Symmetry: C7
């Protein structure tokens, strides 16, 4: 064993408690409330447009406002899952016990929970990257529309990128709603083994 100073140890123990209280309130209060808010956004008219010709913008020059406005609403939700998933993962990580030869089935559930939260955080970060990739790809296609006015397929590439972003951003909002419901159910179904592994 290595000796640890008591005054710092008491401050570390208060951090471990605060992380425990937040992770439990996030799983049992925030994850359920956030699922209801994200479900309500998907029932709004902006995210349910049948003719995708409506979302098209005339074009080099301007950026799609109908997409810029939806992205501005989606980006705050992706940032909240990444932050809240990190607090929940740390809580499960600090409940994993001393490595021992037997009674390691509960530890596997705790290790499976930490691996799911790492997948959710990585998928959420990819969604933020896809929004940046849309702006760079539309920006390049706009430069090519001006450089080669004769080719009509350059213009069709901008309309295709805009329509695919509308489908992709609506799918990201459905996936964020699905991740909050899936993580709440799994953590609550497997709570006794996650809280008390052995």
């Amino acid at each position: 064993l290595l000796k640890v100073d008591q005054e710092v140890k008491l401050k570390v123990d208060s951090f471990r408690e605060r992380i425990t209280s937040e992770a439990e309130d996030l799983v049992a209060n925030f994850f359920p409330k956030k699922l209801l808010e994200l479900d309500s956004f998907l029932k709004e008219p902006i995210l349910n447009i049948h003719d995708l010709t409506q979302i098209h913008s005339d074009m080099m020059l301007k950026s799609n406002q109908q997409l810029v406005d939806i992205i501005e609403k989606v980006k705050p939700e992706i940032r909240l899952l990444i932050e809240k998933c990190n607090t929940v993962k740390m809580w499960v990580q600090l409940l994993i016990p001393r490595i021992e030869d037997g009674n390691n089935f509960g530890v596997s559930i705790q290790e499976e929970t930490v691996a799911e939260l790492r997948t959710v955080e990585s998928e959420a970060a990819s969604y933020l990257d896809q929004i940046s990739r849309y702006y760079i790809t539309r920006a390049k296609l706009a430069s090519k529309i001006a450089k080669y006015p004769h080719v009509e397929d350059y213009a069709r590439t901008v309309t295709e990128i805009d329509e695919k972003e509308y489908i992709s951003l609506r799918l990201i909002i459905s996936e964020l709603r699905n991740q909050y419901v899936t993580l709440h159910d799994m953590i609550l179904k497997n709570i006794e083994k996650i809280k008390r592994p052995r």
Copy 2:
């Protein structure tokens, strides 16, 4: 266990019921009706042209309107599988039980069902990317036909891309019809274990 507020819990239970009702009607009613519509599209003349020299457009400048018209009908069908597959996957996920050492054969069927729905949803998204890649590739080749008028293989590259897109778009419509029938049969054959795993 972590305590959950009852009023928000009652709202979460209504979401879980709505997702169950929709997923059951999509597998039982929509998936079979969509298979009949996609099979009817494949017997229409626009998708059954023996001489692919009739799909050719003279060319920089214009974009094939025989292909732009088919892509316009294919893209709405690809978007419906991605959205409907996501609702059915969530229904199976919310049925997966507390992790336990034994009686996990039914859980495997529920986990195999979610893995197939993820493969179907990823393949459908790839089909939408392929339509965008056609427009960028034809656009680049159209720019080269103008830059190098002398090379006659630049023109043959545009005729080849148009013929490969026609064969590819008909294969996407047949694959989308195959995914609706294959997913209906598997979910209906394996329903008792998916609904009641243990």
Copy 3:
């Protein structure tokens, strides 16, 4: 179980029978007739040229018309295998039974058959891509022959690409004939287990 409307169910059952009837005739009557036609093409003089200096075109400018003429014959055959393999794969997929703990040896033969048909369909689609890559690569090499008239190796690169495409297109016709005979023998040597898995 989920209830299914009877009138649509009768229509789904009629589709399942048509896919069964077509798939049985393709394995039994079309795969054997197509092997005999593809074998006869390989004995025609155009696909059996010993001196490969006779398939050479003088060159920027023109595209080989000895190669363009063979590609025009090879491309329709690659398209027929992709469409017919898709109908046979679906017939086998609709015969795979409810997942159960035992008696899964026949299911493995049905799953192994679907995996072979997926490999044949992917290899056939790759062959269509190889023909498009020939045109883009020859087109670029032709642009370089005009940009750098001094380098003698740019011209040798065009003669090499034309000779390799002749060897490659003849290998594709042999591989397509081999896939028809191989799929016919495996499907009718393993029919009893594929039709009746358990």
Copy 4:
């Protein structure tokens, strides 16, 4: 055995003791104090800005100074984990015993600890690379904003990169804090087998 000079052996033993002393203080005193400092930074206002439009710089030309100031604070903390993790890994490596057929469960804990410390050191080095990629990518986008003033998406690409860097730097400060608490708990829980494997 190979004979080793005693005077150099005495000096190697003092190095081996100094590394043991430092690693034990780093795990029991520094790792806990650093978690407390990194948690306090996350509660400071600079890292808690709700409207991410307040971190936007007007733009070619100038670099974000709200981001340059945070990177100047984040980069020293990443450098301390990489150096301190290397001292702790060497201590665990020098406790691994002579390879023997049995009683190798504790050696697995020591080998698992060295693998976690190698993962922490690699992840920390990646975070330093991500800060360099932000500057090169913003520099390139700034050059394109000057080259193509007409395209409005080039400007949106810079605001998007600045907002993603703010979210990423707050995540690096949280991950660095999480690595100090995770490594302190694992090494202290598993100390008896890490110090005395057999």
Copy 5:
């Protein structure tokens, strides 16, 4: 079972007999004679030049005649192995029996034989690609010797590529000779199980 037309079946059986006769004569007569011809080429002076400075061409402009002449002899031999290996692979493939739970050791030898022939046919096709890559790389290096006359290393890159091609082409003639002897020995040693698997 599926019924097959007798007249088309009789023609399919004649094809299977012709493939069997050719594959048996290729393994027993052609593979041994080809190994003797390829061994005789390797003892000729053209492929046994000690001073590799003698195979150098002065250079943009001219391509190496000494190497163009050897590639002209090597390329026909690579084409014969690819075509003849395809006939031998099909004969072994048409001998693989109905899938059964036991007595599957001979089937493994037949499957190992088809996998080796697929490796030989793929390695041979790569050798044809390597010859095309030499011409494109020498062409690019020749364009750079003219663009940057001052840099002496551009000239040394052409002499190095020519010497490496001489070594590579002699290794390809030895590998083609080694594939003929290796495939003859394995197929004759393992014939009883390949011809009669069970």
Copy 6:
């Protein structure tokens, strides 16, 4: 067995004895002396600069002298480990016995030791590549600072590369010291089985 000429055998035996003597002195006397020298360099002021803004050079034009001076000291130490690790690997490789069915636990230690030395020798060679990548990356960024004088992120990219190189070169010196102590401990602990495997 194959007969070997005695006079050449006696000379081969003298080589194997000389390699054995060197490998034993290198593990017993040089690995320990080199670890003390590399540890002393890490306590020197040049490798321990807290303000990393003191290692910054004004900038196209000049290269960082503070970094050039350290790379000149680091590169000789990386070269000595690569050369000495090769003599120690050959000594262990030439002690591996005739392949036999049993008593292969000691051979595994000898095979595991040769694999660690291959990892050290490959990692050390990578460090020499990283020093070359610094010069090419700083050189490209310096070309861009002159081409695009307006963008201030190009200048921040050079200061960042210089700071990451200082952190990296101090990490290479600590890793080289750690490899000498780790290799000496493992080879000396596992000596009886490495020298006499069975």
Copy 7:
């Protein structure tokens, strides 16, 4: 079995005997003599220069003669290992017996010997590619030194590539010597099972 013509069979048997005699003389006379010649080269002054600033050439324009002179000696030695390893691999391949269910331990030693010789022959071919990459990389860096005279790091990149090539060429000469001694010991230690597997 397939009948084989006796006269061609007698000629194949003489080829098989010639490969056996050559392979046994290479393992027992050439491999030992080549290890001694390559060890003597490593003790010559040209490959043992302490100050690597003495191998530097002033520079666009000239190529390093001190390196062109060492590469001219190293390249003939890499070529001999590739050709001689191919003769030894074929001898071991032609001794591998008919596949049988049991008594397959010796076949594993013969299969391990063919795999080692394939790794040695692939590594040697890569060393020849590395000599070509030095020339193309030095040539490109020399072109950039003339294009951007202001950037001093372009010049430091040529001095670094030259010093790394000197270290790499001495490492290739030691690796070629190590491969001759390692292959002689493994083949002579494991000869009885390689010559008579069962």
